[PDB]
């Protein structure tokens, strides 16, 4: 108490500006007493930051610190039976209110677990307070520190720095486990250095239960089983086995009997059980339509562009919502469109027939704005309807397209042009064909597919790609887009959403459907030869899955001819297998599902089995799944029959077995062409959770809700410990009950004690010892909105608009500024839709209800007849109203559609209004907003409005002043639930909060659990602990490349020796193991670092994995609420209801292993136990295997003296390795001909290319920023694809595919763009710098206009190398811009000015010229701050072809424009300069209007020759030379041969050399490297440094010999 007199005068600089300081300081001065001084003398800061966070927001400070129900009852309000919690600030008027908290942390660690508990605390009030007639916006004040205004941030740290002795002095002078937590609460901005010593500085209190955990856990271990006693028992165990259970048949292997499994396959796949046909097109509904189109159409205009132009004009004017309601905003421009249609009928004699029946309209059909086929006659009604409803209508709505509008409107008269309907009747009854029809829910003639020539076989896939693109841009339709008529097995088609596609110059096709969005529609495909319609089928599928083949006709064609070309030896057999494989590819392309996918992946297991000589005996028992349709059988007869076609011939059909295996394997990986998406989300997450919990509860460890930090009840603990001791039971010599997870703890003692002795290949060495914001809920993961965001941003925008109208008294809402703030902070009509269209349908229907409930939560602010009985109110209205408790989440099958018409159609009173009033002031929306969908055609949303409308919404205190457990929350920064004395089973704070997620792998969904922050904070130390372990280990590869490479090489040279090697995997490696197994492993580890030859301490390691042992895996709500309505887990959760009927949310278990959570800790277990099993085999079977493990895959390479008769050994390995719950998968294969390791199949004499995986990989993962970066992605993946020795021609065909993906997207083209076509060598010698060089200098083919600028490249580069400086400061000649840099260069080289003339009109049009293609700095900075700082493939592409038609291209002038407008700034300059490449290269006079986008190509060509001199070269200057035979498929491994002249280890050599280049660029954020750190400072698209800080990644390339001597050369 030496500062207690100073402590009064210290906060004497706090003037009582309010009541929050006056009474608080007059009670501060009236007693010198240290006993409440840490409480009463410190609560002034508990008043200050409280009031300040209340001083910021709209807040009336209740200094009483009281509850929710009496603050509602201070006015005249009956108390609504609220639960009572504590807020500290209100704003209560109207019929809504504001509860607010404040929480402040410097750590990221429990700053989030406070907000989670806070919003959970006020959102267990949403069940009860919303029913009172009042909503609330529970707002929080997240703070990293103390941001106060009534103090100037200078005395609060004196309050933490001078009181930091006074609690030490008082706790000496005078609470104990509320002493150091006050220390941990009063910390500054900590660099709180947490290592493995993190557990050491807590208390370690216990539970008086963990003794039984150890008593269940550490008994059978001694770590002291002698190495002679291991051999003695293990020899007798082998002698026990070899007479025990090998010969009586409980093994798992056989000799495969290679003939017999062929028959097993024939009975497996060739479904003689099925009712399926032979010709496949009869069976599936889409192949019907394909074979219709390609053999009803292969045997076989200024008004065009005018109609298309004015149609796109209608699309542009439609995206406004400026017709004050959402129904006329289609129909007035429909009137415009049909007026132009009759004006086209009034244009020529043959106008609406000869170029329109062959055009965009067919018989009784009109095409217009969105994609709407409208089928003319209805519009003849509708305008008659609309002029029926408003007789005086086209008087204001026409020149509202001029006034309050851009007024750029190219319409001749069609605005006010109320047409003669009789004139429209003339065209309408002129042409009528059959109306389109759609089908829900025998005969056969399809030319027997292989009875055709090979030429029309691509005409198949062209129609496939044409209908595929139609399915693609089916998505491109707007996602709300509600039509004009609502409302079944066979439906006459009134007006449909309908895409298009060409086929030839006359006949085009369509695609008919009704539902908007992403989900499955019921399609219908009609052709029109010359106007004559034809239905040609009606199928059912889902759009977002056919993103693959959109132009891959040449791509699949290249592989369907390429793979077929592997049979150059059996010509007629090749002539058989060719066409069937192409139809096979078609059928797989026809049917994406999970079943056909998983099957076709599952064929390599059989193929490795027939290739090798031993399988696991249960593989064919699981190599089929049940066909849910008749469609899965179609693929399951052909490749299966193809297996039958060339595995077992009646003669010796194993001749060229290597090509056979390669071929059929690439057939089997041709599975992977199905886009891995698990066709729906809610049937995936339940399937993933059933994959999660079924072996668990079969092993029997399901418990219900823990306390989430620590303590348990007795009974849940009992089944916990029951599973624990049942786990380790599993004796060393029982052969039954072996498929149960666990281990003989005493055989674990053999393994770990022989490990402690240094006779394994690994030991306890342990070099360099390991001892060194928006947050969601947990029950909806796999999605992209939490529930807490969906109240967070709602409350933010609600409180923001709560401010704007009570400054002056506006008292009105803006119906688009209520849609502007949310559209800003999540992702002015054009300013909204400028980035509003950059969303997803999941995001669209979320944003709609966000619009809804923000409009509701602002409609609640100004708030201060059921006798129209149609149906029973107690059976339709109020019964469903109380079953739902919400008018909002009302379903659609409990009612019908017409009751949403008729009871919604109640007559007008003060419940409705007319003259819809798009001003819309607040508080009157109860009659104003309700008529918005009454005057739209829709019925559901107004029904929700009308049912939510009309009130259907119904001294001890001085000692406990020092805050103990009875007084925790009375501060905010008291740091309540930090660890203070950590639990034996928990971290004292959380209990390892996890959730559910899948991964979408090829066959099965690999899982992931949802970590919290502290859970990951503990996960990191354990996984990097094992990382430092496995670095000292010798036979792991989860992160090491080198040992994996040596495993590869010795694997190959074992296979070339003709030696034997296994290949495993592990069925349910994830859900099997438990943390306590790994604790028991860690118990008998010595871990003697060679620093200190001594057993290290593991109590920070052993007691932290106890917390993993008791983890909280949550449940998805989508697996929880799907089980609510009415599959053994679905059976199990319904008997969790007949217990204590809480919903099973929090679930803890024993044996979990999040995959990638404790992964490497299993890897050392999966290393050491593997080497232990490997160790016996040198003494039990006198052979030397070597076993690698990548923590989920394993391999043992067997060395045999002087043939598979030692299967005696082999399943015995299983019989050993099954005992340690590393269960041998039924998918494993062991033999001597084919060995894997992670899809690297190392067969005799060669190596498997595995073509179609990478080929599929390029045709997937087309994600979208820029056609540099997007075409950098497929540039990368083409580097990977040609690493495997595919060809060159496939690569260019992929390049042409992605080129056409650009070209369809409306970017147009550029010689940067996609990479080149026909690239023959460039992959081998060099990165993108040489590829863009070849692409650009193949344009200048005569090699006379660009050899000059490469001469300039030599005259610059040989002066800018060593030996001479010669302006190494070129730093500012370049950075001025594009042209004038090159003008300095070219005169610097030595020539005339005439070259500077003749070159610099070579121009191209850049669209990310000045900035980017904005679809929401030089990118060099981003690559450096990426490397230096350390929604499918279809569904982005639609937001890519939509956010390219927007307002996108920028000038340096502030503002944006369109791509076609830049292409409207064009001319034609036929003299040899524009005419070099059409719409690619320009004259300057061809762009004399807009030449500022006309950047020069030759500047970037010069910079490319310098980058080709940077990253490699001194041959890249030279002339492209002339090449000048072998087997076509004699492919082999070639080497890079790159001559690099830079200096290596660049990672600091460029970052420090950004200062020497441009100062503010790194101020806010060698000999040669800096001159091309300078060739990407000013521009963006060279590709320089990114592939010199990272590496080429392959260096080993294999290619065909016909891609080497056929390739060019560029010698110096």
Residue numbers in the entry: 2 to 175, 180 to 305, 321 to 461, 468 to 513, 520 to 804, 820 to 874, 886 to 922, 950 to 1039, ...
What do the study authors state?
The arenavirus genome comprises two ambisense RNA segments encoding four viral proteins: immature glycoprotein precursor polyprotein, nucleoprotein (N), large RNA-dependent RNA polymerase (RdRp) (L), and zinc-binding matrix protein (Z). The L protein is a multi-domain, multi-functional protein responsible for transcription and replication of the viral genome. The Z protein is a small but multifunctional protein containing fewer than 100 residues. The Z protein mediates multiple functions through interactions with viral and cellular proteins including negative regulation of viral RNA synthesis, orchestration of virus assembly and budding, and countering host immunity.
The final density maps for the monomeric and dimeric L–Z complexes were highly similar to the apo MACV L protein structure, except that additional densities were observed that were designated as Z protein in subsequent model building. Structural comparison revealed that the monomeric L–Z complex was nearly identical to one monomer of the dimeric complex; superposition of the structures yielded root mean square deviations (RMSD) of 0.5 Å, suggesting that contacts between the L and Z proteins were identical in the two structures. The structure of the L protein in the monomeric and dimeric L–Z complexes was also highly similar to those of apo L protein monomer and dimer; superposition of the structures yielded RMSD of 1.2 and 1.3 Å, respectively, suggesting no major conformational changes following binding of Z. Considering the high similarity of the monomeric and dimeric L–Z complexes, only the monomeric complex is discussed below. Previous structural study showed that there was no large conformational rearrangement between apo and vRNA-bound MACV L protein, especially in regions required for Z binding. It implies that the Z protein might interact with L in multiple structural or functional states, such as the monomeric and dimeric L protein in both apo and vRNA-bound states.
